[PDB]
Design a protein around this ligand. Structure first.
Ligand SMILES: Nc1ncnc2c1ncn2[C@@H]1O[C@H](COP(=O)(O)OP(=O)(O)OP(=O)(O)O)[C@@H](O)[C@H]1O
Ligand SMILES: Nc1ncnc2c1ncn2[C@@H]1O[C@H](COP(=O)(O)OP(=O)(O)OP(=O)(O)O)[C@@H](O)[C@H]1O
Lengths: 159, 591, 85, 597
């Protein structure tokens, strides 16, 4: 869709092996790619790739960003975790996969992390140091709204 | 004891009952412990636990161990040993827990530490240096009172005892216990722990811009002792101990010597390694091809043009060359050593960085250098308790590994004479004050040197162009001169890849080679001999009218070279087919 | 004091390498070791001359890089004439 | 004594400078931060109460604890556990004092001062709180160091038989802090006379620590005092000084204010943004703009390419100032050091006592060993100025050959063999041999003998000073104008007013820039260049067809490549321009000309 991040969300390569042989390799001279060839794929294509069958066209292996080592690591110190490092496009992204695979488990998990970041990021509302760098872009923008919110507020405060 | 201690133990029931995977693992220890009991008429008590379960168990008990492990831990210590009793109580003792993590906060490197991170179990990683050597330490004591008999008993607690602070109780040592009978020291019934202490420097890779690294200490006890040599890359995890006075201990500035105790300290490669099946089968699949080796060659120079013959020699050096030691006689040198030479901007030193990475052992060298390089240089005086302790230099520290040398020509000849001892003899010899020993350095080695004078490395004769006479020439199995000669046809090739520079898999290689190292040595086959005998002889029969030096040592390399390719082929036996490869690079060695 | 080498090798053969690199300090000693049956130290308060019965053999390398047939004898050798005599 | 607390608490609350009060703001501002800190303006403090300032100034050390224990009070109001005491830093810029004069009178007197630090100690703990128990009575107690001037100030009380002082340390329950132990030296300019500059150990605690890079020019405040120690007399104590606060001239520190980016954006928009810097480097200097221009390209930092494998592009290049005296190149580098945020001026030999080789030195006590430091390490990741490079001893001169490329030094001295990282950008000013005639000679036959020394160098400049009448009289008078009434110096104001760089801000600009953009060349620039040097590679060999001896390397081209990002970095653009590249060609062509001679 029209948000740069929307198309930006589909751009990252996703390591999904196909269910079928595919003559006319889009990437090269297979020409067909043998069934269960493991390859990273852009989300947009991969979005509907296995969506058509009735068996799905791609096995669609789960993201390393979603690794159990990731999902547990976040359980420790999300405040300390660098989301700018992980993807960095994540919540706007993972929601797609979580929309894609339709799992509730990490959802009940990650959403809280979103809050955990939020609480402290609310501390940033006051007017640094190094934490600001680890924020995701969508996670980064949120502050712009808040920073200027009080900025004009305090600048409004006097004269 | 507070139920807070008894409850935390009681709080550890359902865990590790769930996850119960550790329950039988300790039982797996129980059995093997029983196993050894079966044969003799070895495993450490301490067990690994992924911290993670606490997040599915107690998040308060979770972070608390990260907060006040000093408290939560000791009860967890009991239940393990306690259940350890229940696990096997039939037949007639720290039982520590590691925690890989499940991190972290508490994830920090040594360069950035505390004051808050103090008194908390934390992962910290880096070089192992300088790693104080081990000494034995008692805890329990026992005695006999004659003539009334019975048996005496005594316990001890130091400053580094357990985890938490406890009342210091140096006892001297138990004697004449009432009634006043003579008490003879009794041992082996009494308890002992060999003690170890080491610091660790933070990585220069992760080191900041303009500042020096600060290595920080950690205690090593029981199995924790001697798990690793000094200089290693490893991540230590444990609570940070602040014990000791601030000068207040004696009424009268700086204060509080401090270090982390325990726990895991997982060795880290940045060897090891896991292999499995799928992976090694690629090795098993790739091994069949005789076409693989050039691929092995081409993968070596991602940024580098050609010199593939120079490349081929590198992997053949990775093989090790199949050391064969004489029975009750001296071994001939197994491994191969080489030196890159040629006009400036060769990217020879650049190549060493490639030699510097996947190689995994070992340290390189740029010119000077010393005093001693791999020499211990007699670490002294004392250090500690009046005890003289040598600490091996890089050349020793690099044993069973790679040695790269930059500016080898600039290096002082003083230690060069030692490099004769370093290379031909392939062992270290030491007498200084001092300790008197000869220790093995078999380390694989390579160096690099500029032309003696200017760009004339082409025109002027290669002799007088060596820059480091004489036997130094005999030592190296290969010396490749790099001509700086330029061609527009060449430069045209030189551009785009240099252009693509700014804008088959490598890691698979070192796994392919590492397993290729212990399996399997090709030994020897006369068929390889049949052609090479006419070869090397003919080499002395021709080359001596062309170049030099020419020695049987160069012939000895032929066995090394073919030995390596036989490994490159993963051949269980040598083949004459490999010699043509070695001879050709040896042809390229001359030309 | 701890002696060795020549003092240790006395009444027996002494094998030797890098004989050209033994420099002067060795040469004069073995120069005297050719006078044999003696080792002379006037150093410190030590005035002693101790018997060295050592059998002597050392192999040494020709002038760099290797010997040149055009090179005349004794020009090729790196050792002193009185040492070879 | 007591209740003087509320008076600060009053100024903590009662104070409002219109329209908005500060420190009360700063507190909550630090609250969510968990900063646990306050920076006080002392010159501001007098504005509140005239009495308490000097009332504080009388024995400031004793009223130190009267603050942070007070600041927590309403902070605790605002907090509504555990809550460690905040760290206050008061500061003043008003009367700066020379290091040359420290009078015992100044003991327990707060003094703001400029300074140049030699170094600082590795951090060590101090326990702000501790629990302690009788080794006998089983009696439970707790103690704190609430504040301190090291004394040692406190010890174990001996009143629990049981004794003596049976109470003992408990570290787990105890809570801790840190100290830097800075060693600061006076500014070299004045007033050492013929005597060597005094050096002083400054005490940094908690937040004070890690706040300053070693060797940096800094302004600091704190209290004069003396510690007996032992490790003097009769009964004489060694001098030491508290650091509070230290407000140091920025940076002198990766972070900066946001509006700075914008004012730079104003600079980034300028079409002359590069060309104005061409003038800024040489306010007093006249001509040699090419070499003058060749300065800036190195100023922005070299190409760092770390992508696998571990092979990485280096920085920043190499440059040679060689030419007859009257080149003003040594005078040039003196400007160079001033322009670099971190740089080392070296005319040696070494400079001044510094080992041109970073070298090993033993610890006096407890034996052991450590890196003694080296100029490459001192300035690492920054500018390098070198004079007498031809006068350099060739042995450690060898180490230079390594230092420039691999950019990592390693020594086996003693037991510590570790390989240090050196990212510095060196520039060689060494004077050519025999004046003019060496140009009548080969371009070589100057540095050492071999040009292999030149091989490691990138842009090497041979100054040709020609005696042209009009050319001299221009700068000739330009010289007099440099002098009283400093007519040229007043010209910069209008240049400061209208356009021209202030160069201290520019340093911040560069430091801004150096960390900001990572320019990657456009694909067509390279092919434009690939087609370029292949000619140059082919052409100079056509000069080599005569067997003429002088030179060329593929490293020669790579150096040029770093020029691509060089000015482009000034542009701030993500990728190198096609057009942008060309000036690098003709500029390096002027460098190639030196080979042409
Ligand atoms: N085969 C090659 N492939 C790519 N680049 C090369 C090659 N040979 C030389 N170069 C270039 O030449 C330069 C070599 O610089 P480097 O510092 O690596 O030289 P070095 O190995 O130290 O040689 P020396 O010891 O003679 O200085 C690099 O910029 C590199 O890009
Ligand atoms: N382009 C120039 N701009 C300003 N002054 C100059 C210029 N060229 C020469 N001078 C004057 O000439 C004198 C040169 O003295 P200086 O000591 O700087 O020479 P140098 O080139 O640094 O010496 P060396 O050649 O030994 O490095 C200075 O007083 C300087 O003002």
């Amino acid at each position: 869709y029209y948000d740069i991040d929307d198309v930006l969300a589909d751009g990252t390569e996703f390591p999904c092996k196909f269910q079928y042989d595919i003559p006319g390799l889009g990437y090269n001279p297979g020409r067909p790619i043998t069934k269960n060839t493991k390859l990273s794929l852009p989300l947009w294509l991969a979005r509907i790739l296995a969506i058509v069958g009735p068996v799905p066209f791609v096995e669609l292996l789960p993201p390393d960003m979603f690794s159990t080592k990731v999902m547990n690591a976040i359980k420790t110190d999300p405040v300390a975790l660098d989301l700018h490092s992980i993807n960095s496009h994540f919540f706007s992204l993972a929601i797609k996969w979580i929309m894609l695979f339709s799992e509730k488990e990490l959802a009940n998990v990650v959403s809280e992390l979103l809050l955990q970041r939020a609480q402290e990021l609310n501390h940033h509302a006051s007017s640094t140091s190094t934490f600001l760098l680890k924020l995701e872009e969508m996670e980064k923008e949120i502050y712009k709204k808040s920073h200027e919110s009080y900025k004009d507020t305090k600048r409004w405060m006097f004269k | 004891p507070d139920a807070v201690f008894g409850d935390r133990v009681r709080r550890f029931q359902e865990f590790l009952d769930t996850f119960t995977s550790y329950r039988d693992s300790v039982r797996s220890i129980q059995v093997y412990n029983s196993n050894n009991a079966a044969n003799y008429n070895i495993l450490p008590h301490r067990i690994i636990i992924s911290l993670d379960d606490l997040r599915e168990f107690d998040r308060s008990f979770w972070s608390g161990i990260l907060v006040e492990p000093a408290y939560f831990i000791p009860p967890a210590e009991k239940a393990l040993t306690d259940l350890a009793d229940s696990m096997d109580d039939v037949p007639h003792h720290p039982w520590k827990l590691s925690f890989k993590g499940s991190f972290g906060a508490h994830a920090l490197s040594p360069r950035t530490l505390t004051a808050q991170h103090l008194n908390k179990l934390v992962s910290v990683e880096g070089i192992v240096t300088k790693t104080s050597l081990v000494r034995p330490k008692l805890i329990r004591s026992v005695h006999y009172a004659a003539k009334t008999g019975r048996f005496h008993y005594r316990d001890y607690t130091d400053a580094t005892t357990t985890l938490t602070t406890r009342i210091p109780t140096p006892a001297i040592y138990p004697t004449e216990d009432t009634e006043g009978n003579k008490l003879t020291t009794e041992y082996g019934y009494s308890t002992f722990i060999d003690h170890q202490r080491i610091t660790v420097q933070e990585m220069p890779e992760m080191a900041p811009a303009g500042q020096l690294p600060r290595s920080i200490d950690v205690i090593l006890d029981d199995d924790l002792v001697d798990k690793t040599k000094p200089g290693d890359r490893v991540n230590v995890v444990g609570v940070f101990k602040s014990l000791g006075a601030g000068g207040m201990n004696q009424s009268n500035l700086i204060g509080f010597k401090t270090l982390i105790l325990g726990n895991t300290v997982y060795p880290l490669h940045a060897a090891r390694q896991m292999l499995t099946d799928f992976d090694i089968r690629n090795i098993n699949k790739l091994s069949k091809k005789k076409d693989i080796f050039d691929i092995l060659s081409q993968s070596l120079a991602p940024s580098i043009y050609g010199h593939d013959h120079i490349k081929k020699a590198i992997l053949l050096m990775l093989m090790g060359g199949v050391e064969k030691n004489l029975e009750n006689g001296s071994h001939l040198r197994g491994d191969i050593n080489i030196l890159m030479v040629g006009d400036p901007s060769t990217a020879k030193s650049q190549l060493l960085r490639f030699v510097l990475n996947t190689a995994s052992l070992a340290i390189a060298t740029t010119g000077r250098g010393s005093s001693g390089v791999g020499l211990t240089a007699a670490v002294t005086t004392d250090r500690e308790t009046g005890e003289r302790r040598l600490e091996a230099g890089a050349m020793v520290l690099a044993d069973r590994g790679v040695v790269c040398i930059d500016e080898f020509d600039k290096m002082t000849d003083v230690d060069r004479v030692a490099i004769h001892e370093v290379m031909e003899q392939q062992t270290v010899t030491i007498a200084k004050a001092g300790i008197h020993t000869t220790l093995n350095a078999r380390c694989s080695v390579i160096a690099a040197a500029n032309p003696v004078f200017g760009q004339y490395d082409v025109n002027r004769d290669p002799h007088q162009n060596i820059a480091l006479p004489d036997s130094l020439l005999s030592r190296f199995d290969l010396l490749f001169v790099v001509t700086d000669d330029i061609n527009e046809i060449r430069d045209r090739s030189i551009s785009e890849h240099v252009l693509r520079t700014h804008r088959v898999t490598i890691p698979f290689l070192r796994k392919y080679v590492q397993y290729a190292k212990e399996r399997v040595i090709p030994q020897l086959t006369q068929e390889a001999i049949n052609v090479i005998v006419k070869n090397y002889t003919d080499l002395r029969n021709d080359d001596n009218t062309k170049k030099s030096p020419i020695t049987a040592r160069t012939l000895e390399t032929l066995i090394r070279l073919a030995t390596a390719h036989a490994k490159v082929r993963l051949s269980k036996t040598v083949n004459k087919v490999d010699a043509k490869v070695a001879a050709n690079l040896l042809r390229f060695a001359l030309l | 004091l701890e002696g060795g080498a020549l003092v240790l090798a006395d009444n027996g053969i002494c094998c030797i390498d890098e004989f050209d690199k033994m420099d002067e300090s060795d040469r004069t000693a073995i120069h005297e070791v050719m006078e044999q049956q003696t080792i002379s130290i006037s150093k410190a308060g030590i005035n002693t001359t101790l018997n060295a019965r050592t059998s002597i053999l050392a192999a040494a390398n020709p002038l760099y890089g290797r010997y040149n047939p055009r090179l005349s004898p004794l020009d090729n050798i790196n050792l002193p004439a009185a040492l070879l005599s | 004594n007591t209740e003087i607390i509320k008076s600060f608490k009053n100024f903590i609350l009662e104070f409002r400078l219109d329209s908005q009060f500060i420190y009360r703001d700063q507190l909550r501002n630090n609250i969510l931060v968990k900063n646990y800190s306050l920076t006080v303006n002392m010159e501001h403090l007098i504005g509140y109460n005239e009495d308490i300032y000097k009332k504080l100034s009388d024995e400031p050390s004793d009223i130190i604890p009267l603050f942070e224990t007070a600041i927590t009070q309403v902070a605790k109001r605002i907090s509504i556990n555990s809550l460690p005491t905040f760290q206050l830093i008061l500061n003043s810029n008003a009367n700066q004092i020379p290091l040359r004069d420290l009078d015992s009178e100044h003991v327990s007197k707060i003094v703001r001062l400029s300074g140049i630090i030699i170094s600082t100690s590795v951090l060590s703990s101090r326990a702000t709180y501790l629990s302690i128990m009788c080794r006998n009575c089983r009696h439970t107690t707790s103690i704190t160091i609430n504040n301190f001037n090291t004394g040692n100030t406190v010890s174990l009380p001996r009143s629990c038989n049981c004794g003596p002082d049976p109470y003992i340390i408990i570290h787990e329950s105890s809570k801790f802090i840190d100290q830097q132990f800075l060693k600061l030296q006076e500014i070299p300019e004045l007033v050492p006379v013929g005597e060597m500059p005094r050096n002083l150990t400054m005490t940094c605690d908690r937040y004070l620590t890690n706040k300053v890079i070693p060797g940096t020019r800094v302004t600091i405040v704190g209290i004069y005092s003396i510690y007996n120690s032992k490790n003097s007399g009769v009964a004489i104590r060694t001098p030491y000084i508290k650091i509070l606060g230290i407000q140091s001239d920025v940076e002198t520190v990766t972070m900066f204010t946001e509006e700075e980016e914008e004012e730079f954006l104003q600079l980034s928009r300028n079409p002359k943004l590069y060309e104005i810097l061409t003038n800024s480097i040489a306010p007093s200097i006249f001509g040699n703009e090419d070499i003058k221009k060749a300065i800036v390209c190195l100023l922005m930092g070299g190409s760092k390419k770390i992508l696998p494998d571990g092979m990485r592009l280096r920085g920043d290049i190499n440059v040679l100032l060689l030419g007859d005296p009257g080149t003003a190149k040594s005078q040039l580098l003196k400007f160079v050091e001033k322009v670099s945020p971190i740089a080392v001026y070296t005319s040696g030999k070494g400079s001044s006592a510094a080992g041109l080789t970073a070298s090993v030195q033993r610890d006096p006590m407890t034996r052991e060993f450590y890196l003694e430091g080296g100029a490459m390490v001192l300035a690492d990741g920054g500018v390098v100025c070198i004079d007498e490079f031809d006068k350099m001893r060739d042995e450690d001169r060898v180490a230079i050959h390594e230092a420039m490329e691999q950019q990592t030094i390693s020594i086996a001295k003693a037991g510590i063999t570790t390989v240090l990282n050196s990212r510095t950008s060196v520039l060689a000013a060494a004077n050519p041999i025999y004046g003019r005639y060496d140009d009548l000679k080969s371009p070589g036959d100057n540095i050492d003998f071999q040009t292999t020394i030149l091989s490691r160098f990138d842009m090497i400049f041979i100054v040709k000073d020609d005696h042209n009448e009009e050319r001299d009289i221009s700068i000739a008078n330009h010289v007099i104008n440099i002098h009283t009434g400093n007519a040229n110096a007043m010209q910069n104001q209008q240049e400061e007013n209208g356009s021209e760089i202030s160069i201290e801000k520019m340093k911040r600009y560069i430091t801004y820039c150096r960390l900001k953009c990572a320019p990657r060349l456009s694909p067509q620039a390279a092919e434009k260049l690939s087609s370029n040097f292949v000619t140059i590679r082919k052409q100079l060999l056509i000069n080599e067809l005569e067997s003429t001896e002088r030179p060329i390397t593929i490293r020669q081209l790579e150096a040029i490549i770093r020029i691509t990002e060089s000015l482009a970095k000034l542009e701030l653009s993500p990728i190198a321009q096609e057009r942008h590249v060309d000036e690098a060609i003709r500029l390096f062509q002027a460098s190639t000309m030196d080979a042409a001679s």
